[PDB]
Amino acid sequence: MMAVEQMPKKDWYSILGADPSANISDLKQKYQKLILMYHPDKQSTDVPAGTVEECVQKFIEIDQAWKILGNEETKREYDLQRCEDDLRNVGPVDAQVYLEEMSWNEGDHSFYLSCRCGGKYSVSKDEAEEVSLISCDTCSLIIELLHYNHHHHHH
Protein backbone atom coordinates (compact mmCIF):
# COMPACT_ATOMS: atom_id res chain seq x y z
CA MET A 1 0.00 0.00 0.00
CA MET A 2 1.78 3.10 -1.30
CA ALA A 3 1.03 6.35 -3.13
CA VAL A 4 0.17 5.86 -6.80
CA GLU A 5 1.97 8.81 -8.40
CA GLN A 6 4.80 7.17 -10.34
CA MET A 7 7.01 10.23 -10.79
CA PRO A 8 10.05 10.47 -13.12
CA LYS A 9 13.59 9.74 -11.95
CA LYS A 10 15.75 8.96 -14.98
CA ASP A 11 18.36 10.76 -17.08
CA TRP A 12 15.65 11.05 -19.74
CA TYR A 13 13.51 13.79 -18.21
CA SER A 14 16.78 15.22 -16.89
CA ILE A 15 18.26 15.42 -20.38
CA LEU A 16 15.44 17.69 -21.58
CA GLY A 17 14.47 19.03 -18.16
CA ALA A 18 10.85 18.55 -19.20
CA ASP A 19 8.39 18.09 -16.34
CA PRO A 20 6.24 14.93 -16.23
CA SER A 21 3.24 17.11 -17.05
CA ALA A 22 4.72 18.52 -20.25
CA ASN A 23 3.43 17.32 -23.62
CA ILE A 24 4.95 16.08 -26.88
CA SER A 25 4.27 19.51 -28.38
CA ASP A 26 6.19 21.63 -25.87
CA LEU A 27 8.84 18.90 -25.90
CA LYS A 28 9.03 19.04 -29.69
CA GLN A 29 10.28 22.62 -29.95
CA LYS A 30 12.13 22.28 -26.65
CA TYR A 31 13.89 19.21 -28.04
CA GLN A 32 15.51 20.79 -31.09
CA LYS A 33 16.54 23.65 -28.79
CA LEU A 34 17.66 21.77 -25.68
CA ILE A 35 19.47 19.05 -27.63
CA LEU A 36 21.08 21.69 -29.85
CA MET A 37 22.53 23.42 -26.79
CA TYR A 38 23.46 20.04 -25.32
CA HIS A 39 25.73 19.34 -28.30
CA PRO A 40 29.46 20.15 -28.06
CA ASP A 41 30.40 23.78 -28.69
CA LYS A 42 33.83 24.09 -27.09
CA GLN A 43 37.31 24.45 -28.60
CA SER A 44 39.37 21.54 -27.27
CA THR A 45 40.97 18.83 -29.41
CA ASP A 46 42.63 17.21 -26.40
CA VAL A 47 40.10 14.41 -25.97
CA PRO A 48 41.89 11.14 -26.85
CA ALA A 49 39.56 8.14 -27.02
CA GLY A 50 36.93 9.89 -24.92
CA THR A 51 36.13 11.94 -28.01
CA VAL A 52 34.28 8.91 -29.37
CA GLU A 53 32.82 7.70 -26.08
CA GLU A 54 31.29 11.17 -25.73
CA CYS A 55 30.02 11.48 -29.30
CA VAL A 56 28.42 8.02 -29.31
CA GLN A 57 27.04 8.66 -25.82
CA LYS A 58 25.50 12.02 -26.71
CA PHE A 59 23.80 10.36 -29.69
CA ILE A 60 22.00 7.74 -27.60
CA GLU A 61 21.45 10.28 -24.83
CA ILE A 62 19.57 12.97 -26.76
CA ASP A 63 17.63 10.16 -28.43
CA GLN A 64 16.97 8.42 -25.11
CA ALA A 65 14.69 11.17 -23.81
CA TRP A 66 13.54 11.91 -27.36
CA LYS A 67 11.22 8.92 -27.06
CA ILE A 68 11.10 7.86 -23.41
CA LEU A 69 11.46 11.43 -22.12
CA GLY A 70 9.59 10.20 -19.06
CA ASN A 71 8.53 6.91 -17.48
CA GLU A 72 7.97 3.72 -19.48
CA GLU A 73 4.35 4.70 -20.09
CA THR A 74 5.76 7.74 -21.89
CA LYS A 75 6.41 6.05 -25.23
CA ARG A 76 7.12 2.35 -24.76
CA GLU A 77 4.62 1.31 -27.44
CA TYR A 78 7.41 2.04 -29.93
CA ASP A 79 9.92 -0.20 -28.16
CA LEU A 80 7.82 -3.37 -28.20
CA GLN A 81 6.71 -2.30 -31.67
CA ARG A 82 9.97 -3.25 -33.38
CA CYS A 83 10.27 -6.13 -30.92
CA GLU A 84 7.06 -7.98 -31.78
CA ASP A 85 8.05 -7.42 -35.41
CA ASP A 86 11.63 -8.60 -34.88
CA LEU A 87 10.44 -11.70 -33.01
CA ARG A 88 7.99 -12.91 -35.65
CA ASN A 89 10.77 -12.77 -38.24
CA VAL A 90 12.53 -15.42 -36.16
CA GLY A 91 9.58 -17.78 -35.86
CA PRO A 92 9.98 -21.35 -34.56
CA VAL A 93 13.75 -21.82 -34.40
CA ASP A 94 14.35 -23.38 -30.98
CA ALA A 95 11.37 -25.67 -30.44
CA GLN A 96 7.86 -26.03 -29.04
CA VAL A 97 7.03 -26.30 -25.33
CA TYR A 98 3.99 -27.95 -23.75
CA LEU A 99 2.01 -26.22 -21.00
CA GLU A 100 2.27 -29.54 -19.17
CA GLU A 101 5.98 -28.84 -18.75
CA MET A 102 5.78 -25.26 -17.49
CA SER A 103 5.69 -25.72 -13.71
CA TRP A 104 2.40 -24.17 -12.59
CA ASN A 105 2.27 -22.35 -9.25
CA GLU A 106 -0.96 -22.40 -7.24
CA GLY A 107 0.34 -19.45 -5.24
CA ASP A 108 0.00 -16.88 -8.02
CA HIS A 109 -1.60 -19.19 -10.58
CA SER A 110 1.11 -18.92 -13.24
CA PHE A 111 3.68 -20.92 -15.20
CA TYR A 112 7.43 -20.56 -15.68
CA LEU A 113 10.03 -22.24 -17.89
CA SER A 114 13.80 -22.60 -17.51
CA CYS A 115 16.17 -22.65 -20.49
CA ARG A 116 19.12 -25.04 -20.77
CA CYS A 117 21.74 -22.28 -20.94
CA GLY A 118 21.24 -20.07 -17.90
CA GLY A 119 18.28 -17.77 -18.38
CA LYS A 120 14.61 -18.53 -17.79
CA TYR A 121 11.10 -17.22 -18.46
CA SER A 122 7.91 -16.74 -16.45
CA VAL A 123 4.42 -16.00 -17.76
CA SER A 124 1.13 -15.52 -15.91
CA LYS A 125 -1.84 -17.85 -16.36
CA ASP A 126 -3.57 -14.88 -18.00
CA GLU A 127 -0.57 -13.60 -19.96
CA ALA A 128 0.15 -16.95 -21.59
CA GLU A 129 -3.54 -17.01 -22.49
CA GLU A 130 -3.12 -13.78 -24.46
CA VAL A 131 0.39 -14.34 -25.81
CA SER A 132 2.23 -17.32 -27.30
CA LEU A 133 5.63 -16.21 -28.61
CA ILE A 134 8.28 -16.55 -25.90
CA SER A 135 11.99 -15.91 -26.40
CA CYS A 136 14.97 -16.57 -24.13
CA ASP A 137 16.84 -13.73 -22.42
CA THR A 138 20.30 -15.21 -23.03
CA CYS A 139 20.67 -17.42 -26.10
CA SER A 140 19.39 -16.59 -29.59
CA LEU A 141 16.33 -18.86 -29.51
CA ILE A 142 12.55 -18.78 -29.13
CA ILE A 143 9.83 -21.25 -28.14
CA GLU A 144 6.07 -21.53 -28.56
CA LEU A 145 3.59 -21.62 -25.67
CA LEU A 146 1.05 -24.30 -26.58
CA HIS A 147 -1.80 -25.05 -24.17
CA TYR A 148 -2.82 -28.69 -24.57
CA ASN A 149 -5.59 -30.21 -22.45
CA HIS A 150 -4.63 -33.59 -20.99
CA HIS A 151 -5.88 -34.10 -17.43
CA HIS A 152 -9.66 -34.48 -17.58
CA HIS A 153 -11.46 -35.80 -14.50
CA HIS A 154 -13.45 -32.83 -13.20
CA HIS A 155 -11.07 -30.89 -10.96
**Contact residues: Zn ion, CB under 5 A:** 115, 117, 136, 138-139
Q: Between 19 and 137, name the residue whose CB sits nearer to Zn ion.
A: 137
The annotated binding site for Zn(2+) is made up of: 115, 117, 136, 139
Residue 121: CB minimum distance to Zn ion, A: 9
Beta-carbon count within 10 A of 134 CB:
19
Q: Between 50 and 118, name the residue whose CB sits nearer to Zn ion.
A: 118
Question: Treating both helix axes as pointing N-terminal to C-terminal, what angle do 77-88 and 50-68 enclose, rounded to 10 degrees?
Answer: 100
d(CA 122, CA 141): 16
The annotated binding site is made up of: 115, 117, 136, 139
Contacts by 28-37, CB closer than 8 A, 24 or more apart: 31/66, 35/62, 35/66
Q: Between 17 and 118, name the residue whose CB sits nearer to Zn ion.
A: 118
Residue 96: CB minimum distance to Zn ion, A: 15
Residue 91: CB minimum distance to Zn ion, A: 17
